[PDB]
């Protein structure tokens, strides 16, 4: 019964299929603009990429069906662009209207965020490892001193 | 892995949402048109373009959401490793203090 365009329903069913019944699936919230924006930017990126991909692949068939009229080809490109934007517009409308568990971190869907977090945590890890290396050396020095002192 | 499991799941839910939309709706409808268009060779080609366009977008969406999932899962592990190194740091500091105190009293 659930149709692919009913995003609110699909999303709630998918969560329920994947995770046990517990508190996390009890409060629900509409998504943030950056979640919507991140997802639509992914969709737009791939839509432009697909358009170029596909039109280049079928260039000869295209040019042979338009009898060399490259203006008509640009027109067909624009028609397909318009079809995809109308689709993406409904995707955005239905996603804005869907709900997600409130404990999720929607910024996890933003490549800018998770990329900048990863660079920082990698650097922080390297700094702390070196600090522990140094503390291990200091501790060793002190433990040697204690062993000598225990023997007077 | 429980603090992040609902956020990781969100990425999979979205990936499944768009596979369902493209593979179980947009692409079947474009096929239904393309199979029906043997009289108009132009519209047959254009429906084929729709087919390829939806399949390309859907496959690439899945790959990019898997990228995002892999980044998050890897980041979460690094964050937990950082917690362990910081726990060890605090312990090394305390042990250094205790050993120094011991030397001070035995000296």
């Amino acid at each position: 019964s659930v149709r692919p365009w009913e995003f609110r329903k699909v999303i709630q069913a998918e969560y329920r299929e994947r995770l046990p019944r517990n508190y996390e699936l009890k409060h629900w919230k509409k998504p943030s603009k950056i979640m919507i924006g991140s997802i639509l930017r992914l969709l737009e990126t791939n839509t432009v990429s697909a358009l170029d991909s596909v039109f280049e692949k079928y260039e000869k068939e295209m040019n042979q069906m338009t009898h060399g009229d490259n203006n008509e080809v640009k027109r067909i490109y624009s028609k397909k662009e318009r079809l995809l934007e109308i689709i993406l517009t409904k995707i955005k409308k239905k996603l804005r209207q869907a709900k997600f568990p409130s404990r999720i971190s929607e910024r996890d869907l933003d490549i800018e965020y998770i990329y900048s977090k990863r660079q920082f945590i990698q650097n922080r890890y390297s700094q702390e490892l070196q600090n522990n290396e140094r503390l291990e050396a200091i501790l060793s020095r002190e433990q040697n001193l204690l062993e000598e002192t225990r023997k007077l | 892995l429980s603090s992040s499991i609902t956020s990781v799941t969100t990425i999979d839910v979205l990936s499944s949402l768009f596979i369902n939309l493209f593979e179980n709706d947009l692409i079947p409808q474009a096929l239904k048109d393309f199979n029906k268009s043997d009289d108009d060779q132009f519209r047959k080609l254009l429906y084929k373009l729709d087919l390829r366009l939806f399949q390309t977008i859907s496959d690439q969406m899945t790959r990019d959401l898997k990228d995002i999932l892999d980044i998050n899962v890897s980041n979460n592990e690094l964050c937990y490793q950082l917690k362990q190194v910081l726990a060890r740091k605090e312990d090394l500091n305390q042990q250094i203090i205790s050993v120094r105190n011991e030397i001070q009293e035995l000296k």
């Binding site: 737009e44 990126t45 990329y115 990863r118 | 990019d64 995002i68 980044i71």
Partner: peptide, 18 residues
């Protein structure tokens, strides 16, 4: 290949859009 490689490639492609 690497996660960072893949991450940077996605970041670049999304920034090049709009």
């Amino acid at each position: 290949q690497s996660i960072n490689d893949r991450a940077l490639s996605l970041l670049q492609r999304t920034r090049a859009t709009k």
